[PDB]
Coordinates of C-alpha atoms in Angstrom, one line a residue:
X4 CA 4.1 0.7 -17.1
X5 CA 4.0 -2.0 -19.4
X6 CA 0.7 -3.1 -21.9
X7 CA 0.0 -6.6 -22.1
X8 CA 1.9 -7.9 -18.3
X9 CA 0.0 -8.0 -15.0
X10 CA 2.5 -6.6 -12.3
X11 CA 1.5 -7.4 -9.4
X12 CA 2.7 -6.6 -5.5
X13 CA 2.2 -7.9 -2.1
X14 CA 3.8 -7.4 1.1
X15 CA 6.4 -10.1 2.1
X16 CA 4.7 -11.5 5.1
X17 CA 1.3 -11.8 2.7
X18 CA 0.5 -14.9 1.1
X19 CA 3.7 -14.4 -1.9
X20 CA 3.7 -17.3 -3.3
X21 CA 0.0 -18.7 -3.1
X22 CA -0.9 -15.9 -4.9
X23 CA 1.7 -16.3 -6.9
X24 CA 0.2 -19.7 -8.3
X25 CA -3.5 -18.4 -9.2
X26 CA -1.0 -16.3 -11.0
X27 CA 0.5 -19.0 -12.5
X28 CA -2.5 -20.2 -14.0
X29 CA -3.9 -16.9 -15.4
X30 CA -0.7 -17.0 -17.3
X31 CA -1.4 -20.6 -18.4
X32 CA -4.6 -19.4 -20.1
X33 CA -4.2 -16.0 -21.4
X34 CA -0.5 -15.9 -22.2
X35 CA -0.5 -12.8 -20.2
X36 CA 2.8 -12.3 -18.0
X37 CA 2.7 -12.1 -14.2
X38 CA 5.3 -10.7 -12.3
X39 CA 4.0 -10.9 -9.1
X40 CA 7.0 -9.2 -6.4
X41 CA 7.1 -8.2 -3.0
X42 CA 8.8 -4.6 -2.4
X43 CA 10.2 -3.5 1.4
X44 CA 8.2 -0.5 2.3
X45 CA 5.3 -1.6 -0.8
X46 CA 3.0 1.1 0.8
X47 CA 5.3 3.8 1.4
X48 CA 7.0 3.5 -2.0
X49 CA 3.6 2.6 -3.8
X50 CA 2.4 6.9 -3.9
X51 CA 5.4 7.5 -4.7
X52 CA 6.3 5.1 -7.3
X53 CA 2.6 5.1 -9.2
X54 CA 2.3 7.2 -12.1
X55 CA 6.0 6.4 -12.9
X56 CA 7.2 3.5 -15.3
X57 CA 8.0 1.3 -11.7
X58 CA 4.0 1.2 -10.7
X59 CA 2.4 -2.2 -10.6
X60 CA -0.5 -2.7 -11.7
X61 CA -2.0 -4.2 -8.7
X62 CA -1.7 -3.4 -4.9
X63 CA -2.6 -5.9 -2.2
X64 CA -1.8 -3.8 1.2
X65 CA -3.4 -4.2 4.4
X66 CA -4.8 -1.6 6.5
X67 CA -6.5 -0.2 9.1
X68 CA -7.3 3.5 8.2
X69 CA -9.5 3.7 4.8
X70 CA -9.2 7.1 1.9
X71 CA -5.3 7.2 2.2
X72 CA -4.6 5.9 -1.9
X73 CA -8.1 7.1 -3.2
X74 CA -7.9 10.4 -2.2
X75 CA -4.6 10.5 -3.8
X76 CA -6.1 9.8 -6.8
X77 CA -4.1 6.5 -6.9
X78 CA -6.4 4.0 -7.8
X79 CA -8.5 3.0 -10.8
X80 CA -12.7 3.3 -9.6
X81 CA -12.7 -0.8 -10.1
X82 CA -16.7 -2.0 -11.9
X83 CA -17.6 -5.4 -10.6
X84 CA -21.5 -5.6 -11.7
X85 CA -24.4 -6.4 -8.9
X86 CA -23.4 -10.2 -9.7
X87 CA -20.5 -10.5 -8.2
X88 CA -20.8 -7.5 -5.5
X89 CA -23.2 -10.1 -4.1
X90 CA -20.4 -12.8 -4.1
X91 CA -18.9 -10.5 -1.1
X92 CA -20.5 -8.7 2.1
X93 CA -21.6 -5.6 1.5
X94 CA -20.2 -4.3 4.6
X95 CA -16.6 -5.4 3.7
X96 CA -17.7 -2.6 0.2
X97 CA -18.0 -0.1 2.2
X98 CA -14.6 -0.5 3.5
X99 CA -14.0 0.0 -0.4
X100 CA -15.8 2.8 -1.3
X101 CA -14.9 6.2 -1.1
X102 CA -16.8 9.0 -1.8
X103 CA -19.3 7.2 -3.6
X104 CA -16.9 5.0 -5.6
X105 CA -15.4 1.6 -5.2
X106 CA -12.0 1.9 -5.4
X107 CA -10.7 -2.3 -4.6
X108 CA -11.5 -5.7 -4.2
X109 CA -12.0 -6.9 0.0
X110 CA -9.8 -10.1 0.0
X111 CA -9.7 -10.3 3.3
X112 CA -11.1 -8.8 7.1
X113 CA -10.3 -8.4 10.7
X114 CA -11.2 -7.2 14.2
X115 CA -10.8 -7.6 18.1
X116 CA -13.3 -10.5 19.6
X117 CA -14.0 -11.5 22.6
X118 CA -11.7 -14.4 24.0
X119 CA -12.0 -16.8 27.1
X120 CA -11.5 -19.4 29.0
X121 CA -13.5 -22.6 28.0
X122 CA -12.7 -24.5 31.7
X123 CA -12.5 -21.3 34.0
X124 CA -15.7 -19.9 31.0
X125 CA -18.0 -22.2 28.7
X126 CA -21.1 -19.1 28.8
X127 CA -19.2 -15.8 27.8
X128 CA -21.1 -13.6 28.4
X129 CA -23.2 -11.4 25.6
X130 CA -23.4 -8.1 27.0
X131 CA -20.8 -5.7 29.0
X132 CA -23.3 -5.2 31.8
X133 CA -24.1 -8.4 33.5
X134 CA -20.1 -8.8 33.7
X135 CA -19.4 -7.2 37.0
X136 CA -21.6 -10.4 38.5
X137 CA -19.3 -12.5 36.6
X138 CA -16.7 -10.8 38.0
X139 CA -17.4 -11.8 41.6
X140 CA -18.6 -16.3 41.3
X141 CA -14.4 -16.5 39.5
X142 CA -12.8 -13.9 41.9
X143 CA -13.6 -16.8 44.9
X144 CA -12.4 -18.9 42.6
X145 CA -8.8 -16.9 42.8
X146 CA -9.6 -15.9 39.3
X147 CA -10.3 -12.6 37.6
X148 CA -13.0 -12.3 34.7
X149 CA -11.6 -9.7 32.4
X150 CA -8.2 -8.8 31.8
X151 CA -7.4 -6.9 28.2
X152 CA -5.1 -3.8 27.1
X153 CA -6.0 -0.6 28.7
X154 CA -3.6 1.4 28.3
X155 CA -4.0 2.1 24.1
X156 CA -7.8 3.3 23.1
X157 CA -7.7 0.7 19.7
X158 CA -8.5 -2.2 23.1
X159 CA -10.9 0.5 24.7
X160 CA -12.6 2.4 22.0
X161 CA -15.0 -0.3 21.4
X162 CA -16.7 0.3 24.5
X163 CA -16.4 4.0 24.5
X164 CA -17.9 3.9 20.8
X165 CA -21.0 0.9 20.9
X166 CA -23.3 3.2 22.7
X167 CA -22.3 6.2 20.0
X168 CA -18.7 7.0 21.1
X169 CA -17.2 8.4 17.6
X170 CA -14.3 10.1 15.7
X171 CA -15.6 12.5 13.1
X172 CA -19.6 12.8 12.4
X173 CA -19.6 10.6 8.8
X174 CA -23.3 12.4 7.6
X175 CA -23.5 12.7 3.1
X176 CA -20.8 10.4 2.7
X177 CA -18.6 12.1 4.5
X178 CA -16.0 13.1 7.1
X179 CA -16.8 16.4 9.5
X180 CA -13.3 16.8 11.0
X181 CA -14.8 19.6 13.1
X182 CA -17.8 18.1 14.7
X183 CA -15.6 15.5 16.7
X184 CA -17.6 13.1 19.1
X185 CA -15.8 11.8 21.7
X186 CA -17.4 13.6 24.9
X187 CA -21.0 13.7 23.7
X188 CA -23.3 10.6 26.2
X189 CA -22.6 7.5 25.1
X190 CA -18.5 8.7 24.6
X191 CA -19.6 9.1 28.6
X192 CA -21.2 6.6 28.6
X193 CA -19.2 4.1 27.8
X194 CA -16.1 5.6 29.5
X195 CA -18.0 5.6 32.7
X196 CA -18.6 2.1 32.5
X197 CA -15.0 1.7 32.3
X198 CA -13.8 3.7 34.7
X199 CA -16.0 1.8 37.6
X200 CA -14.9 -1.0 37.0
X201 CA -12.0 -0.5 37.9
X202 CA -13.4 1.4 41.4
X203 CA -15.5 -1.1 41.9
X204 CA -12.4 -3.8 42.0
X205 CA -12.9 -6.1 38.9
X206 CA -10.3 -4.5 37.0
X207 CA -7.1 -2.8 37.9
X208 CA -6.2 0.3 35.7
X209 CA -3.1 -0.3 35.1
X210 CA -3.3 -3.4 33.1
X211 CA -1.6 -3.0 29.6
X212 CA -0.9 -5.7 26.8
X213 CA 1.4 -7.6 28.4
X214 CA -0.6 -8.0 31.5
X215 CA -3.4 -9.3 30.4
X216 CA -1.7 -12.1 28.0
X217 CA 0.7 -13.2 30.5
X218 CA -2.7 -13.4 33.1
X219 CA -4.7 -15.3 30.0
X220 CA -2.3 -18.3 28.7
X221 CA -1.5 -19.3 32.6
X222 CA -5.5 -19.8 33.3
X223 CA -5.2 -16.8 36.1
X224 CA -8.2 -14.7 34.0
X225 CA -11.7 -15.8 32.4
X226 CA -11.8 -13.8 29.8
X227 CA -9.1 -11.6 27.1
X228 CA -9.9 -8.7 24.0
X229 CA -7.5 -9.7 21.3
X230 CA -7.1 -10.3 17.7
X231 CA -6.5 -12.9 15.8
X232 CA -2.6 -12.4 15.9
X233 CA -2.8 -14.1 19.5
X234 CA -4.5 -17.3 18.8
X235 CA -0.9 -19.2 17.7
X236 CA 0.2 -18.6 21.6
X237 CA -2.6 -19.7 23.8
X238 CA -2.6 -22.8 21.5
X239 CA 1.1 -23.6 22.9
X240 CA -0.2 -23.2 26.3
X241 CA -3.5 -26.0 27.5
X242 CA -6.0 -23.2 27.9
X243 CA -9.4 -24.7 26.5
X244 CA -10.3 -20.9 25.1
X245 CA -12.8 -19.9 22.7
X246 CA -13.4 -16.6 20.5
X247 CA -16.8 -15.4 20.1
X248 CA -19.2 -11.9 19.8
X249 CA -17.4 -8.9 22.0
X250 CA -20.4 -7.5 24.6
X251 CA -22.5 -5.4 23.5
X252 CA -23.3 -2.3 26.0
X253 CA -26.3 -1.4 26.2
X254 CA -27.6 -3.4 23.8
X255 CA -25.9 -1.6 21.0
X256 CA -22.1 -3.5 19.6
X257 CA -18.9 -2.9 20.3
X258 CA -16.4 -0.9 17.4
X259 CA -13.8 -2.5 17.6
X260 CA -11.1 -0.5 14.1
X261 CA -12.1 -3.3 11.4
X262 CA -8.9 -4.5 9.2
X263 CA -8.9 -4.6 5.8
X264 CA -6.5 -6.7 2.7
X265 CA -7.5 -4.7 0.0
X266 CA -6.7 -5.3 -4.0
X267 CA -7.0 -2.2 -6.0
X268 CA -5.9 -1.2 -9.6
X269 CA -3.5 1.4 -10.0
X270 CA -5.0 4.2 -11.5
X271 CA -2.0 4.4 -14.3
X272 CA -2.1 1.0 -15.4
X273 CA -3.2 0.7 -18.9
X274 CA -3.9 -2.6 -18.1
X275 CA -7.4 -2.0 -16.0
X276 CA -9.3 -4.8 -18.0
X277 CA -6.9 -7.5 -17.7
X278 CA -6.6 -6.7 -13.6
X279 CA -10.6 -7.1 -13.6
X280 CA -10.5 -10.5 -14.6
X281 CA -6.9 -11.9 -12.4
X282 CA -8.8 -10.3 -9.2
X283 CA -12.5 -11.3 -10.1
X284 CA -12.2 -14.8 -12.1
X285 CA -9.0 -16.0 -10.8
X286 CA -8.1 -15.0 -6.9
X287 CA -11.5 -14.2 -5.5
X288 CA -12.2 -17.4 -6.8
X289 CA -12.3 -20.6 -3.6
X290 CA -9.7 -21.7 -5.6
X291 CA -7.6 -18.7 -5.5
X292 CA -8.2 -17.7 -1.5
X293 CA -7.5 -21.2 -0.4
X294 CA -4.3 -21.1 -2.3
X295 CA -2.5 -17.8 -0.8
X296 CA -4.7 -19.0 2.7
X297 CA -2.6 -22.1 1.8
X298 CA 0.6 -19.9 1.7
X299 CA 0.1 -17.2 5.3
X300 CA -3.5 -17.5 5.7
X301 CA -6.2 -14.9 5.7
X302 CA -8.6 -14.9 8.4
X303 CA -11.5 -14.0 7.7
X304 CA -12.1 -12.9 4.0
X305 CA -15.2 -11.2 2.8
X306 CA -15.7 -14.1 -0.6
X307 CA -19.0 -15.3 0.9
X308 CA -18.3 -18.8 -0.9
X309 CA -14.9 -19.6 1.0
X310 CA -15.9 -17.9 4.1
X311 CA -19.0 -20.1 4.3
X312 CA -16.2 -23.0 4.5
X313 CA -13.9 -21.4 6.7
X314 CA -15.7 -20.2 9.1
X315 CA -16.0 -24.0 10.1
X316 CA -13.8 -22.4 12.8
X317 CA -15.9 -20.2 14.8
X318 CA -12.4 -18.5 15.7
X319 CA -12.6 -17.0 12.0
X320 CA -16.2 -16.7 12.1
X321 CA -15.6 -14.7 15.1
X322 CA -13.5 -12.6 13.2
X323 CA -15.7 -11.8 10.7
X324 CA -19.0 -11.1 13.5
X325 CA -16.7 -8.6 15.3
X326 CA -15.7 -6.8 12.4
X327 CA -19.3 -6.1 10.6
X328 CA -20.3 -4.3 13.2
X329 CA -16.9 -3.0 13.9
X330 CA -15.3 1.0 12.5
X331 CA -14.0 2.2 9.3
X332 CA -11.4 4.5 10.4
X333 CA -10.6 7.3 8.1
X334 CA -6.9 8.0 6.8
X335 CA -6.2 11.3 8.2
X336 CA -2.4 12.2 8.8
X337 CA -1.3 12.5 12.0
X338 CA -3.9 10.8 13.9
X339 CA -1.5 9.2 16.4
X340 CA -1.6 13.3 18.4
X341 CA -6.1 12.2 17.7
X342 CA -5.6 8.9 19.8
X343 CA -3.0 10.5 22.4
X344 CA -5.8 13.4 23.4
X345 CA -7.9 9.7 24.1
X346 CA -5.3 8.1 25.7
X347 CA -4.2 9.9 28.3
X348 CA -8.2 11.2 29.1
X349 CA -8.7 7.6 29.8
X350 CA -5.5 6.6 31.1
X351 CA -6.6 9.3 33.8
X352 CA -10.2 8.7 33.8
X353 CA -9.4 5.5 35.4
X354 CA -7.0 6.9 37.4
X355 CA -9.0 9.1 39.0
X356 CA -6.9 12.0 38.1
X357 CA -9.8 13.3 36.5
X358 CA -13.9 12.8 36.2
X359 CA -15.0 10.8 32.9
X360 CA -16.7 13.9 32.0
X361 CA -14.0 16.6 32.3
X362 CA -11.5 14.2 30.3
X363 CA -13.6 13.3 27.9
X364 CA -13.9 17.1 27.3
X365 CA -10.1 17.6 27.2
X366 CA -9.9 15.0 25.1
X367 CA -12.7 16.6 22.7
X368 CA -10.7 20.0 23.0
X369 CA -7.2 19.0 22.4
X370 CA -8.5 16.7 19.3
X371 CA -10.3 19.4 18.6
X372 CA -6.7 21.7 18.1
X373 CA -5.5 18.9 16.4
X374 CA -7.0 19.1 13.3
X375 CA -7.0 22.8 13.6
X376 CA -3.7 22.7 13.7
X377 CA -3.0 19.8 10.6
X378 CA -5.3 22.5 9.1
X379 CA -3.6 25.1 9.5
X380 CA -0.3 23.1 7.3
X381 CA -2.5 22.0 4.8
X382 CA -3.8 25.3 3.8
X383 CA 0.0 27.1 4.8
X384 CA 2.0 24.7 2.5
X385 CA -0.4 24.7 -0.4
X386 CA -0.2 28.8 0.0
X387 CA 3.9 28.3 -0.4
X388 CA 3.2 25.9 -2.9
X389 CA 0.9 28.5 -5.4
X390 CA 3.0 31.1 -3.8
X391 CA 5.4 30.3 -5.9
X392 CA 4.0 28.9 -8.5
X393 CA 3.4 31.9 -9.3
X394 CA 6.4 33.4 -8.4
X395 CA 7.7 31.2 -11.8
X396 CA 5.0 32.5 -14.3
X397 CA 6.0 35.5 -13.5
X398 CA 10.1 35.4 -14.2
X399 CA 8.8 33.2 -17.4
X400 CA 6.4 35.9 -18.8
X401 CA 9.2 38.4 -18.1
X402 CA 11.6 36.3 -20.3
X403 CA 9.3 35.3 -23.8
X404 CA 6.4 37.3 -23.0
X405 CA 3.1 35.4 -23.8
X406 CA 1.4 32.4 -22.8
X407 CA 3.2 30.7 -25.9
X408 CA 5.2 28.6 -24.1
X409 CA 2.4 27.4 -21.9
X414 CA 2.6 19.5 -17.6
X415 CA 5.1 21.5 -18.7
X416 CA 3.7 23.6 -15.3
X417 CA 5.5 21.1 -12.6
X418 CA 8.9 21.6 -14.9
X419 CA 8.1 25.1 -14.7
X420 CA 7.7 25.2 -10.8
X421 CA 11.1 22.6 -10.1
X422 CA 12.6 24.4 -12.3
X423 CA 12.0 28.1 -10.4
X424 CA 12.7 26.0 -6.8
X425 CA 16.1 24.5 -8.3
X426 CA 16.9 28.5 -9.2
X427 CA 15.9 29.3 -6.0
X428 CA 17.8 26.6 -4.3
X429 CA 14.9 26.8 -2.4
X430 CA 13.4 23.6 -0.6
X431 CA 10.0 22.8 0.6
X432 CA 7.8 19.8 1.1
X433 CA 3.8 19.8 -1.1
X434 CA 1.4 18.6 1.3
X435 CA 0.9 15.7 2.1
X436 CA -0.8 13.5 -1.2
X437 CA -4.6 14.0 -1.5
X438 CA -4.3 17.2 0.4
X439 CA -4.0 19.5 -1.9
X440 CA -5.8 22.6 -3.2
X441 CA -6.2 22.8 -7.6
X442 CA -5.0 25.1 -9.8
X443 CA -5.3 26.6 -13.0
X444 CA -3.6 29.8 -14.9
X445 CA -5.4 31.6 -17.4
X446 CA -4.5 34.5 -19.3
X447 CA -5.4 38.2 -19.2
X448 CA -9.6 37.5 -20.5
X449 CA -9.2 34.7 -18.4
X450 CA -9.5 31.7 -20.9
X451 CA -7.4 28.6 -19.8
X452 CA -4.0 28.3 -20.9
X453 CA -3.2 25.5 -18.3
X454 CA -6.4 23.6 -15.8
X455 CA -6.8 20.4 -14.3
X456 CA -9.6 21.0 -17.2
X457 CA -13.0 21.7 -15.0
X458 CA -14.7 24.1 -15.4
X459 CA -13.2 27.4 -13.6
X460 CA -13.8 28.4 -10.2
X461 CA -16.0 31.3 -9.8
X462 CA -14.2 33.0 -7.9
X463 CA -11.3 31.9 -5.3
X464 CA -8.1 33.2 -4.3
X465 CA -6.1 34.3 -7.8
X466 CA -3.1 35.7 -7.7
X467 CA -2.0 38.3 -11.1
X468 CA 0.8 37.8 -13.5
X469 CA 2.3 40.6 -14.7
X470 CA 4.5 42.8 -17.5
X471 CA 4.0 45.5 -19.3
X472 CA 2.0 47.9 -17.0
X473 CA -1.0 45.6 -17.5
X474 CA -2.0 41.8 -16.3
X475 CA -1.1 39.3 -18.4
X476 CA -2.6 36.1 -16.4
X477 CA -4.0 35.2 -13.3
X478 CA -2.8 31.7 -11.0
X479 CA -6.3 30.1 -9.7
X480 CA -5.9 28.1 -6.8
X481 CA -8.8 27.4 -4.1
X482 CA -9.0 27.6 -0.4
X483 CA -8.3 24.3 1.9
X484 CA -12.3 23.4 2.1
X485 CA -13.1 22.9 -1.3
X486 CA -11.4 20.0 -1.1
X487 CA -14.6 18.5 -0.4
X488 CA -16.1 18.3 -3.9
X489 CA -13.2 15.4 -4.2
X490 CA -12.7 13.7 -1.0
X491 CA -15.2 11.8 1.6
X492 CA -13.6 14.7 3.7
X493 CA -16.1 18.3 4.9
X494 CA -14.5 21.2 6.9
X495 CA -17.5 22.4 8.7

């Protein structure tokens, strides 16, 4: 990666020419070359090419889960002073704080909102509990109160989590993946209120995305639940709609899944200070965001300065309000199966096929069984890797006869695997346990350079009739001390 320019990546569907103009200004002032690119599949490519020479200095990615790139060691810790942190809303900084350290700049924000038809309903309910009253009044008109995709936990979990439902318990800046909270009181409370509405002939349990939209946009229902991608299609259909806060349940606010456009600084960039200068003094400014927004709207943005202007569009003002109290979901691989547990439960409780209490117990134990399996894999493919690093270093010693030859440790692994025709996959980036190599007197030959673990797995290398060194790794649970994940 070259020093003295900025290479920037942004998705081809975000506003890349608008951003490229913020690049020209910075290049006008500083004489620093700024190149804005939009590769295909950039979210996939970024972890693969980050360290190498084709890595970008800044990546803009739209995301929905949180902590993935940070946990892989891919992002530099950004360093705004307290003056700058105040130019931006406080919850958006927690979307980008990973294990205490800030790792990216919030740009834009997104969430689900309550949409409604102003004509059928000029006053939208502020609460969920008042809604089935709403429903009888307008059933009388040949209309329905509310219709939204019930098939997907994305839409139903804001209710189920308002009163205390949670995916993983978050205490001490860590997520505890053993402590699942999909079968607690708040969970049952929210899910029950959901099933009642269907039993009490106020919602239809087979309502999905395509039903609830087709209705709302042809008048036949007064409220829908959807995100900003919907708006531009009611606008075609002469419903006079509004967008506002999702109803509270038991007084608590609804917790939809927050989505963020972020800018992070490549941990390998030699241009981190250049990058900080461009993002804080050129992009995260009204003139800067206005410039990408003109290319492709950002929706709600985290720069208070600009948000106050943009919220002179109360839909954009509703997006922001629904996100301040929403969910920041951690990035764990294969969560789709986790939400599949929750999805079949919600489908069954509303089916009547199960009671709320006993679908949510099936959820809690399935979900928990998926996490157990996942960690059994994280655990096995780390063991595979270290047994392999061990067998390799054994044969390397049996050639040289000393530790003279010992980032050469990766070549030794690659070479040993190639020579054995061995094809196995490393564990997901960010879920790999550390390792060290030490001679027989426990002097550090090769090591991720922290003070070695006092105890833990360790494999002897042997020559002669003696032990010449050890390969020291770590149990999977000590991935706590570097991540936002807790295995207890």
